Amino acid sequence: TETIPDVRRLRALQAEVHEELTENILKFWATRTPDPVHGGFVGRVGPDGRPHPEAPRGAILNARILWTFAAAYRQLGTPLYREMAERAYRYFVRHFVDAEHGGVYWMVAADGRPLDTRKHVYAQSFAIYALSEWHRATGGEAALALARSIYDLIETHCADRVHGGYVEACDRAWRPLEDARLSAKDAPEPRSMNTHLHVLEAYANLYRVWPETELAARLQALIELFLRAIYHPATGHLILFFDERWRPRSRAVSFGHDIEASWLLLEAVDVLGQATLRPRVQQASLHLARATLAEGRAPDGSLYYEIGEQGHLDTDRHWWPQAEALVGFLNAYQESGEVLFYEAAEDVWRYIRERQRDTRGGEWFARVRDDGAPYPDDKVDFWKGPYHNGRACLEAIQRLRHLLEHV
Ligand SMILES: OC[C@H]1O[C@@H](O[C@H]2[C@H](O)[C@H](O)[C@H](O)O[C@@H]2CO)[C@@H](O)[C@@H](O)[C@@H]1O
Numbered sequence: 001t002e003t004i005p006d007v008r009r010l011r012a013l014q015a016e017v018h019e020e021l022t023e024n025i026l027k028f029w030a031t032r033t034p035d036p037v038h039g040g041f042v043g044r045v046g047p048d049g050r051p052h053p054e055a056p057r058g059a060i061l062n063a064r065i066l067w068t069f070a071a072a073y074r075q076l077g078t079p080l081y082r083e084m085a086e087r088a089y090r091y092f093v094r095h096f097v098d099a100e101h102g103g104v105y106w107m108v109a110a111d112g113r114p115l116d117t118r119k120h121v122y123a124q125s126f127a128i129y130a131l132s133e134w135h136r137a138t139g140g141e142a143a144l145a146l147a148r149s150i151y152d153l154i155e156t157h158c159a160d161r162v163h164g165g166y167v168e169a170c171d172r173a174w175r176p177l178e179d180a181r182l183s184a185k186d187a188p189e190p191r192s193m194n195t196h197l198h199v200l201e202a203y204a205n206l207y208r209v210w211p212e213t214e215l216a217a218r219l220q221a222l223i224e225l226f227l228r229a230i231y232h233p234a235t236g237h238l239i240l241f242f243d244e245r246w247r248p249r250s251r252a253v254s255f256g257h258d259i260e261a262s263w264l265l266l267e268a269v270d271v272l273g274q275a276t277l278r279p280r281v282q283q284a285s286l287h288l289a290r291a292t293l294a295e296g297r298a299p300d301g302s303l304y305y306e307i308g309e310q311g312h313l314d315t316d317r318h319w320w321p322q323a324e325a326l327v328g329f330l331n332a333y334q335e336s337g338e339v340l341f342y343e344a345a346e347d348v349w350r351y352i353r354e355r356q357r358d359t360r361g362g363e364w365f366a367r368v369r370d371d372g373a374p375y376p377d378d379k380v381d382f383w384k385g386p387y388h389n390g391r392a393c394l395e396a397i398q399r400l401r402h403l404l405e406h407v
């Protein structure tokens with residue numbers, strides 16, 4: 001009694017996604033961004049496509065490069081992807097990893113000198129996520145050992161064992177800071193959904209390659225925190241910012257984070273094999289996906305950016321909510337069997353192909369305005385790597401493969 005798109009449609013979508021990943025996204029990253037002056041990868045590519053090898057380089061971006069090429073190598077086997085992941089890994093260990101106090105710096109100069117030495121849990125999480133993926137792709141002992149050490153530092157220096165979750169930012173020597181903001185966009189509050197979502201993401205990937213008992217308890221506690229404090233059943237949206245006791249300190253809505261969390265929360269519970277928790281997580285996951293479907297979409301099926309603190313709808317199409325909606329809508333289809341979610345995934349894919357991707361300049365535009373005009377944003381910067389759209393294509397390819405095997 002399944003309602004399944006026919007084989008032609010599944011295979012056609014899968015082929016377009018694979019072409020987008022390999023002939024646009026990963027081709028752009030492998031050819032435009034490696035830096036032969038300082039090694040590793042440039043920190044910025046302008047809207048004109050010009051790389052900036054002297055620009056400061058962020059840990060999050062470089063972890064995202066590592067994760068994406070590692071995951072693409074694991075799933076597709078292409079030797080160039082292993083080469084690019086190795087390039088990212090070597091620069092990362094040399095320069096971003098703090099050999100003295102542990103963890104990864106926030107920002108380094110192009111030549112690798114530390115520029116911003118704060119230890120932000122969001123950056124520590126992406127390091128764990130990328131290093132665990134690199135271990136998964138290669139079996140590398142050093143990568144896994146490093147991920148484990150950063151996990152230990154997060155728990156040692158940041159875990160709030162009274163109220164749950166984590167202090168989100170420390171200085172280089174792991175002393176907590178007051179200002180945990182990732183950027184000027186973020187509320188000056190002590191707890192954020194965003195950082196906690198990527199702790200969960202990192203811990204789930206680490207657990208898949210290192211199923212330690214205590215880590216299972218920390219991962220389950222994070223899932224439980226999302227269900228009890230962050231997910232809002234009255235609205236189907238994540239609450240974005242909190243005080244230390246998880247009292248809400250924001251009313252903004254991030255559609256991209258909702259639909260990302262929808263599928264990441266289920267990935268995390270399944271990595272645990274926590275069948276007792278799964279019903280409640282699936283319920284919250286499907287709710288987030290439905291709320292996104294009903295409230296976060298333009299008539300073309302693309303995702304709006306946010307509802308701000310004063311209620312303003314930001315109708316800009318940022319690249320990464322579209323990617324996350326591709327995965328989250330396919331995931332909601334797989335979980336519920338409701339083909340309306342597949343139709344939604346197809347619609348966002350068509351938007352990606354017709355508006356978000358930059359066919360002339362390569363990769364994807366960071367932002368497209370509601371009237372269709374691409375903004376002249378950087379193509380690569382501190383916050384724009386290959387991870388959201390690379391992962392979304394990899395996930396879609398594998399999910400469509402599974403669906404194709406129902407026949
Ligand atoms: O507010 C911090 C920055 O967010 C960025 O988007 C992130 C997003 O917060 C989240 O972590 C997502 O899962 O990854 C995204 C892509 O970098 C950007 O909006 C940036 O401008 C913000 O400063």
Ligand SMILES: [Cl-]
Nearest residue numbers: 385386387388
């Ligand atoms: Cl990214």
